[PDB]
Design an enzyme around this catalytic site. Sequence first.
Site, PDB file in Angstrom:
ATOM      1  CG  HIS A 166       1.625   0.876  -3.489  1.00 25.07           C
ATOM      2  ND1 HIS A 166       1.576  -0.287  -3.461  1.00 25.07           N
ATOM      3  CD2 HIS A 166       0.360   1.193  -4.188  1.00 25.07           C
ATOM      4  CE1 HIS A 166       0.829  -1.036  -4.375  1.00 25.07           C
ATOM      5  NE2 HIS A 166      -0.182  -0.128  -4.624  1.00 25.07           N
TER       6      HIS A 166
ATOM      7  N   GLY B 233      -5.762  -0.963 -10.118  1.00 24.32           N
ATOM      8  CA  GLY B 233      -7.043  -0.792  -9.035  1.00 24.32           C
ATOM      9  C   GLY B 233      -7.202  -1.903  -8.095  1.00 24.32           C
TER      10      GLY B 233
ATOM     11  CB  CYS C 111      -3.190  -2.463  -5.052  1.00 24.67           C
ATOM     12  SG  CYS C 111      -1.941  -2.523  -6.264  1.00 24.67           S
TER      13      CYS C 111
END
EC number: 3.4.19.12
Lengths: 304, 304
Positions: free
Chosen positions: B41, B143, B145
Amino acid sequence: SGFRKMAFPSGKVEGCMVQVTCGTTTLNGLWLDDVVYCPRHVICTSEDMLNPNYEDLLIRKSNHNFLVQAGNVQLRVIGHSMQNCVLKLKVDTANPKTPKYKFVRIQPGQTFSVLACYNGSPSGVYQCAMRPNFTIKGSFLNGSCGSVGFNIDYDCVSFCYMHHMELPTGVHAGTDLEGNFYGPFVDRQTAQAAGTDTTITVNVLAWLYAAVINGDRWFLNRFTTTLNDFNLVAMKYNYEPLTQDHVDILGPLSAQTGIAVLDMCASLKELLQNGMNGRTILGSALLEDEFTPFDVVRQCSGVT
Amino acid sequence: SGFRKMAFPSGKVEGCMVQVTCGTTTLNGLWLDDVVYCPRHVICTSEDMLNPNYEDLLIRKSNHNFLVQAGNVQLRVIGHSMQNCVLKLKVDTANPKTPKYKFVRIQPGQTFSVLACYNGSPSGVYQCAMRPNFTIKGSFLNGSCGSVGFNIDYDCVSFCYMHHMELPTGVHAGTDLEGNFYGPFVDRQTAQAAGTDTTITVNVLAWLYAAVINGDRWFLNRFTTTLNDFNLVAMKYNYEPLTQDHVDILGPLSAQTGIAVLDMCASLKELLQNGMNGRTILGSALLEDEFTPFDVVRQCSGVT
């Protein structure tokens, strides 16, 4: 979202841990520049620990009696001195992994990370607070002495604790990196009982703000209070008195949430008087006091 | 003595964290050998996340669109591929700090450490469990991830989790390092509700053994039970069924303490039915389920 008991990343401190052996005693040392710091009780037999005369015991020790191992490599000890309850072993090699560092003496209620070590090898990292009775509630087995507590500000490690002692009640005592014990404790196997382990009120309030930020809100009530009224209730429940300095420190969390500090004190007052009624706050059934206001802001803002 | 929620030392993993940017999205990657692993993603706008076609979005991306930064140094991307829900960015430099490592897919009830990171920079380390509903209860801000979960066996890091998603209920979902989600979750901003978050019974029992080892004994009672009788009570309280395999795994703690597993089940049964009555066990007012039997043995024996 979510709120965890979080330790600082331990890598900078892992790079400083060494093994120190004196005769039959092995524990941990902290290697910064060309000095290894360790508990002075490394020189004691368990027999010695009942009534040690450290100056006298140290006379019988030479540089070559302090065996310092960094990984599988031996460090050469070129000097030794006692500063309060720590030994400073001067080695001939500066630690190439020495981070930016400071020695700080923390106040009760301040939190820090502990890197639990055995034989100079890191086993785990967890978050502690200096209790109001100057103990910490750690996880330390035989061999863990010389494990350290620290905070990190970006790339600077502030070392605040070195592990020395377990009290008969299974709580922990130690020193700053100048070798001064927190609280009244001594490095002797004697009757040392801790005082009241009061709850760190300003830290509970910070954690209630963290709870509201992370959507746990059930405990918010329609009430307010005053510092004096709140403190009458704090005293009854063995909470630390809340000061205007604590109210000032909670100001940013007050601002972020729009809940006035004294309104949150009134929520805390009701929780103390009414209990949790089988409910939880951030996954806890008790009021958590090992997050400082700075911890809550740091974790809620994602500081690296 | 003492028993803490303890994370693995994070240094080996700190040495692997990088920043990955694709267009306006920045998150974390894991740099092992000459591959950086990150959530796919990274290629999505928040708009894209509502109904992303990852194969289609990825067609518009070139190696030079993936900006990989290790500290203040840029890595050259020489290839990219999608494996399930992760991207593998091939770089021209092997990570010189790559530890011994494995990719493992953990089972519900297994614990691991998370190194929460932002912009490739470690912020903190905490201990998690894979919940029975295949969520984790983490601490992750925008932030975070690509932050990873891991276990360490001496010098080998077993990576088991990469952070992808927060559910509308503020619990977390992610993948193993092959890019397969734990549980039924998808990397799409859609209605994903978690199932029952049942209590990990074998972990509670392990922690009750840890409590006895560390001198918290008040909850030990005069009773025993059977697996079937215990399980009738577990079911009522949304505890996981206890199996003979769990009883076998608790054998070493049974042996160490001399408390038969089924006797400890009967202590747990009474705690479920009677509650804690305002008492604590290892500083908790609820039954802690994020220590595995292996965790308890490790922490109680001081493994490095």
